[model samples]
Target: NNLVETTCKNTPNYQLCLKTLLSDKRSATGDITTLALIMVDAIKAKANQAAVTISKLRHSNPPAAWKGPLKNCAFSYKVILTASLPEAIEALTKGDPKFAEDGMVGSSGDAQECEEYFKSPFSALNIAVHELSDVGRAIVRNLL
Candidate 1:
């Protein structure tokens, strides 16, 4: 059976889930564990992208009030991509799918925390990173 299609059914944005998974070659034949890894990888990539954007914003000399939130976002993304994602990868390798799933779900919270620090509505960078985290969480949930 096609796991991607089956898992996409459980996601809120079915088309987005399907399209994202299908874009990866692993989706064609990967099992649940592999799919979970794919989701984690996607999340890491988006976090890295956000980090880069935040770096640019920092160099632009944004307002003093914005500096703290921007710095926090950079640190949050770093922790999620470096620590949490690697933990999830290790958990999957150890055959603890539940732990891996929980790690991935927890990682999404980093983005929400970053967004909450902003006083304004979601910035483009914030929205992009948040959407990626949401997708990753949905994929992890479906893996369970």
Candidate 2:
């Protein structure tokens, strides 16, 4: 409990970090590393979930002007989920929290890029994904 509280204290979204980690059985007694693992896993799941939504939107035949940004957004999430996330995991496994935190921070860029591309009709979805990215970054910051 104290560990979770301390870890969440460093996060921008303290409630989110608290609730998410507390829901895990391991959080009751796990070490900081375990808590960090849970945070990383949760962030990856959020990114993957957003990517799924973006993939579906891509097939919805968005306006011609939105097509390129939409495609780029999807690709960005793909990289975050496939590359950056794994890099964070590897760094964490290797006992390199700083490197892991950097990877997590880098992963947030894709979501920012996606939100920036939204102009009107699709702006809401972009905002939602961007919030998810922000939460992920906050958790990563906590890990630091």
Candidate 3:
């Protein structure tokens, strides 16, 4: 429905947002709240997947410079994966859209924090997570 477009349109990556929401069946007939939650969860899933990718790269033993940054990137992702997304859900559930929005904005920092350390695939992954977080936050903001 238009709710998906209306909400996703305000996001940083409108195409990505539309693709993401459309891929999830819940968003088909869901309200603004459902759209928000699904996008946030999508961020969580991508972040977790990114973590695994980071771990694999770190173990591959490719570049020396990438080692420290990748390690740090892993920790940065942990905050988004384990902490920020949960807080976002809690805030959204408690009717605190502003707080949830902040959490989403904060969670997207993973890309900015780690992108300079490396490029391609890893940086690309972070960018994906960040944009997804931005979309979720944008949807949450509409609730306010």
| TM-score to native of every candidate shown | 0.84, 0.81, 0.90
The TM-score of predicted model 3 comes to: 0.90
Better candidate by lDDT, 2 or 3: 3
Off by over 4 Å in 1: 119-125, 141-144
Error of 2 at 74 (Å): 1.1
lDDT of 3 by residue, 78-97 (tens): 89877888888888777777
Each model's C-alpha lDDT? 0.73, 0.70, 0.82
Predicted model with the maximum lDDT: 3
Clashing residue pairs for model 2 = none
Scanning candidate 1 in windows of ten residues, the lowest lDDT window is: 119-128
| Candidate 1 C-alpha RMSD relative to the actual structure | 2.3
RMSD of every prediction: 2.3, 2.8, 1.5
lDDT of 2 at 126: 48
